[PDB]
Design a binder for these strands. Structure first.
Lengths: 167, 183, 88, 117, 52
RNA sequence: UUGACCUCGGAUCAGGUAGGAGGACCCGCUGAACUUAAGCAUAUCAAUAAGCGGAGGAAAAGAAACCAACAGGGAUUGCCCUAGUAACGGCGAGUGAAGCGGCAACAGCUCAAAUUUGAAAGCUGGCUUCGGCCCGCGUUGUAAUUUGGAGAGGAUGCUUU
RNA sequence: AAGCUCCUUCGACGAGUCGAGUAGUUUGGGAAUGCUGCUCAAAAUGGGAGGUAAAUUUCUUCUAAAGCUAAAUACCGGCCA
RNA sequence: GAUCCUGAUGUAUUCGGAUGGAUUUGAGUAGGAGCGUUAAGCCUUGGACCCGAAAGAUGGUGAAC
């Protein structure tokens, strides 16, 4: 209070803070959602116009009309009707409408390149020297201690040869 | 390797070897200063399980605390008093932890593992540099060490109803008259 | 109450958080011989070597606080007596 | 029950609509950050513990590892694609397993997963 | 500040009052008794076409 | 005679750090009395005020040695009801929670107990032509791997940068 | 470098700490509600807490004594509006 | 609901209450009246219609008997 009285009688300027928020309230960029986001529409109306689900939980209040965003057995097995020990780990194998939805499907379904990993020069030289002495007997290459110092299994060396194209 | 054996030995403190070693050390510590720098932990298994590393920036400090009552009992633990006294001597360090090393008829001896937050070996390590943040200034004074966590009753359950989130915050929450707009 | 088909659950790795491990038993036995005995354990062992088991159990219970801890300590010291006689 | 100094501990709520505006703007900020994604994570259906509420069900914390494995969703991919995982919960019966597995395959049927790059 | 500033009204009574006000708005002597200059207004519930 | 190690010191040596302020809110320690019970001492006031120590933009708490008895739930925090209920009490004054249920917000992790042992693979400083060179710390343990609804090692074949 | 699968191979989990006795303090809370001081001082198919008259402590549910962490929460002070 | 006898078919063989009787009760039934809000009055607690002790406690400032 004494400080505020001091600044009122002081000639020192009042330092006005700009209204800089920590988090932006609208999506931005050159992606699909940014060019179709209405800044004067709420989250639910925007996701309704996109054709997407905004909240995956249980409804917590009433919604506006047209919300569309706030979502034999031989062995008695409950799971056998659910079917369509290792699964693919880094992705899923998933098998009229609004334009944003179709654009999202199109950009998610477009073909991509793979950037196939090559082999080092020394690995190719090792696999080459391994072929020059035994040819195709991958069991003999695994047995070889001199040319295969890391005692790798014949299956691994066969896989490396197949990747090198040296069969 | 050897730390498993030392943990099992530390679990027999009245056996002949451990009793002999505790008495000889107590004699030496009694004749040293109250708060003195320890070159290495006397109990390496205990210091290692509490987060001590043989790295530049880690310091042990042995401290003796007069034992007994304050029939008004001091609600502060003797181990908490030890960390506070060491934390004032080493005001540039952060108290990491502490552990019992010895006890006498009139004193209880504790070793306090401290960490230097300004050493570059500590500031670059993502496992310890949380202590470099200024919210960890003097953890021993705010009940934020192990003794502080025990004495504040910070446990889960019905037995710790009034203290598990802070006793005074719970009391202020229960003694607040909430008046809404539409009553 | 309600009827549901109970499942067989996966074995919990937190089960038996003590020790069924042989190495910890080895370390515990070795440390016991190296360290020696506590004075109260030596009094219990000198009562057990004289056949006064009742006094030993009462002394252990008095100095430990529980009848179960007393029983466990008396069995441990009797085992130590047995291996000491076997080595003798 | 005014024995203590309740004057110093009266909490009024004149900032109720302002806090509602703040909460809605926080949800808008979450939407801006996660632009095509929902702002919420998927949560399982669980039964209410006591006998009084045994008849009804509610939303849980996260899906069991057995439920994720049975639905065909790997454990490490699940938190990165909007599914919540709870390692404490157990199924204990073949009827909660089937329900949450059905929920997970229903979620999988309506998901647009984008490649990494 | 912990005076009662706001009043809780039942939503049924508020909807009753809103319907009564809507019904009163369709009566023209009530419009002039309130103080509205409607002497050139052709019909009291003044409906215009949406195309305008 | 000489050189290590260990321990304890000195230096106006080099690089740093702490103290004070503020303290509405927050985390601890310490701690009354008036008053009510138409007297008053248990009780209440109040685990409050005053006093002392320590932080931040929030703090604290926090990923169960939890709740529960269920067809089960599932870190912490806060709002609503639970509920003036249970419980305790010159059973008087009175004091007085919590689980469940609805909601807001949600996020999980790091170590110690292992032998890298076919190679301390780790790090602080000083000198720099800035590219790589020295001293030191450290084996009484610095990296990697692992953290018990786990994990390791081999084998195996796909999938990832 | 990494995830998963399989198994005639392994799987280490915190002690003057739990706990017993006792004196204070605190709580709605003698399974002392929690904490602290003194004396004694543990375990390993272990330990903690609950359920149950049900025939004996059957069963249920978690892992203490090491540590980090945003959000929702508070706000008579600071920069403003 | 519950209480007082008489004490059925039956009963796992130690459980049960059928018939007839009682000076029975109840904040019991015998065709629901409540919930929310507004206005006024009254009661209890908060400074409590306004002003008005001696005190007591906490933390400080000075002296000098």
């Amino acid at each position: 209070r004494e400080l505020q009285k001091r600044k009122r009688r002081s000639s020192r300027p009042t330092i006005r803070m700009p209204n800089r928020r920590k988090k932006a309230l609208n999506p931005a960029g050159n992606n699909i959602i940014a060019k179709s986001w209405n800044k004067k529409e709420t989250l639910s109306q925007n996701y309704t116009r996109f054709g997407l689900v905004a909240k995956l939980g249980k409804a917590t209040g009433g919604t506006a009309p047209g919300n569309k965003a706030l979502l034999s057995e031989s062995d008695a097995v409950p799971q056998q009707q659910q079917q369509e020990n290792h699964i693919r780990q880094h992705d899923l194998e998933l098998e009229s409408k609004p334009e944003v939805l179709r654009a999202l499907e199109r950009e998610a379904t477009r073909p991509v390149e793979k950037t196939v990993r090559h082999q080092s020069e020394r690995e190719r030289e090792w696999l080459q020297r391994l072929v020059d002495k035994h040819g195709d007997d991958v069991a003999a290459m695994a047995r070889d201690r001199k040319l295969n110092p890391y005692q790798q299994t014949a299956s691994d060396i066969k896989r490396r040869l197949k990747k090198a194209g040296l069969l | 390797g050897a730390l498993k054996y030392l943990e099992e030995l530390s679990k027999k403190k009245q056996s002949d070897v451990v009793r002999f070693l505790l008495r000889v050390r107590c004699w030496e510590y009694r004749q040293l200063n109250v708060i003195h720098r320890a070159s290495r932990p006397s109990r390496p298994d205990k210091a290692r399980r509490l987060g001590y590393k043989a790295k530049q920036g880690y310091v042990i400090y042995r401290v003796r605390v007069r034992r007994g009552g304050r029939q008004l009992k001091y609600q502060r633990s003797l181990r908490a008093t030890a960390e506070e006294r060491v934390g004032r001597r080493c005001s540039n360090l952060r108290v990491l932890n502490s552990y019992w090393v010895n006890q006498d008829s009139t004193y209880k001896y504790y070793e306090v593992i401290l960490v230097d937050p300004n050493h570059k070996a500590i500031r670059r390590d993502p496992r310890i540099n949380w202590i470099c943040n200024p919210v960890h200034k003097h953890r021993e004074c705010r009940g934020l060490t192990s003794t502080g966590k025990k004495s504040r009753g910070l446990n889960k359950g019905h037995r710790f109803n009034k203290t598990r989130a802070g006793r005074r915050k719970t009391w202020k929450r229960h003694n607040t008259l909430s008046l809404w707009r539409y009553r | 109450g309600h009827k549901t088909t109970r499942r067989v659950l996966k074995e919990r790795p937190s089960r038996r958080k003590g020790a069924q491990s042989k190495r910890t038993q080895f370390v515990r036995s070795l440390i016991r011989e190296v360290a020696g005995l506590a004075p109260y354990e030596r009094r219990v062992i000198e009562l057990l070597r004289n056949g006064k088991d009742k006094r030993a159990r009462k002394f252990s219970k008095k100095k430990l606080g529980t009848f179960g801890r007393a029983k466990r300590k008396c069995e441990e010291l009797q085992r130590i007596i047995a291996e000491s006689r076997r080595a003798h | 029950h005014f024995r203590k100094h309740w004057q110093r501990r009266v909490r009024c709520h004149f900032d109720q609509p302002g806090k509602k505006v703040t909460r809605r703007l926080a949800r808008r900020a979450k939407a801006a950050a996660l632009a095509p994604r929902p702002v919420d994570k998927l949560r399982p259906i669980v039964r209410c513990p006591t006998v009084k509420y045994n008849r009804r069900t509610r939303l849980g914390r996260g899906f069991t590892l057995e439920e994720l494995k049975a639905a065909g969703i790997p454990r490490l991919l699940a938190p990165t694609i909007g599914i919540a995982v709870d390692h404490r919960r157990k199924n204990l019966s073949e009827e909660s397993l089937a329900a949450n597995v059905q929920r997970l395959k229903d979620y999988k049927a309506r998901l647009i997963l984008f490649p990494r790059k | 500040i912990w005076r009662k500033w706001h009043v809780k009204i039942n939503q049924g009574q508020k909807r009753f009052a809103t319907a009564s006000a809507l019904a009163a708005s369709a009566v023209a002597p009530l419009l002039m008794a309130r103080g509205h200059q409607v002497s050139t207004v052709p019909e009291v519930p003044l409906v215009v076409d949406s195309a305008a």
